[PDB]
A and B are shown apart, each in its own frame.
Chain A
Amino acid sequence: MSLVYMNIMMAFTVSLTGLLMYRSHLMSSLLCLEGMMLSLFILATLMILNSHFTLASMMPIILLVFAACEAALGLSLLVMVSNTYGTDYVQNLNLLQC
């Protein structure tokens, strides 16, 4: 079962709960998205190296280049949010009331 997989899945679940519950900073939400990227990266890479399935080592490089451009998109969105307000708090987003 290769015991390191347990701690990496534990780190994934903690990073997911950190992504879900968050106090005020959307910066921290993008930061936990980056961490969850790293968790899936390391788990998939240790999978591929246990399997010796080295034809498909495309998972690490391509997963993280795509998820990093996602993080760049989120950072530009946070630039726009902090431009059209003072800060980037979860409060003062409660307009556009449902």
Chain B
Amino acid sequence: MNLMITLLTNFTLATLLVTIAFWLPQLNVYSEKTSPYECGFDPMGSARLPFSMKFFLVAITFLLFDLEIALLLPLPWASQTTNLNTMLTMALLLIFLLAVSLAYEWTQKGLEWTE
């Protein structure tokens, strides 16, 4: 809870920056500043319109390679046991499987479209 103490002090610092932004300097005359600005002209609607995106495979690609990051990240505790053979073998097999999946979707233009 000492890092929670640090989080508490930074929360109090951030809220005092909010209050010193809002309440101290001057007045608050609204009613045209609140209008949505794009580049000089009043546009149609707003955001939250259906915004069809370019990449489809790339976010799922990130997700699955983050999952193999999750399986690979205990490498230092891999490196200290009496079974060196299975250690090095399954480590090489996991990275080689990662490279195999990458090589498949690299050769099958899974990244060469709307990137």
Identify which of B50, B63, B71 contacts A72 (C-beta below 8 A). Answer: B63
B67 in the interface, Cβ–Cβ < 8 Å? yes
Point out the residues of chain A lying under 8 angstroms from B63, CB to CB. Answer: 68-69, 71-72, 75
With an 8 Å Cβ cutoff, the count of chain B residues facing the other chain is 9
Q: How large is the interface on A (under 10, 10 to 19, 20 to 34, 35 or more residues)?
A: 10 to 19
Interchain CA distance A69-B67 in the complex, whole Å: 8
Residue contact B56 to A65, C-beta cutoff 8 Å: no
Identify which of A61, A76, A79 contacts B70 (C-beta below 8 A). Answer: A61
Point out the residues of chain B lying under 8 angstroms from A75, CB to CB. Answer: 59-60, 63
A87 in the interface, Cβ–Cβ < 8 Å? yes
Q: Contacts A86-B50, A87-B50 hold; do A79 and B64 have CB atoms under 8 A apart?
A: no
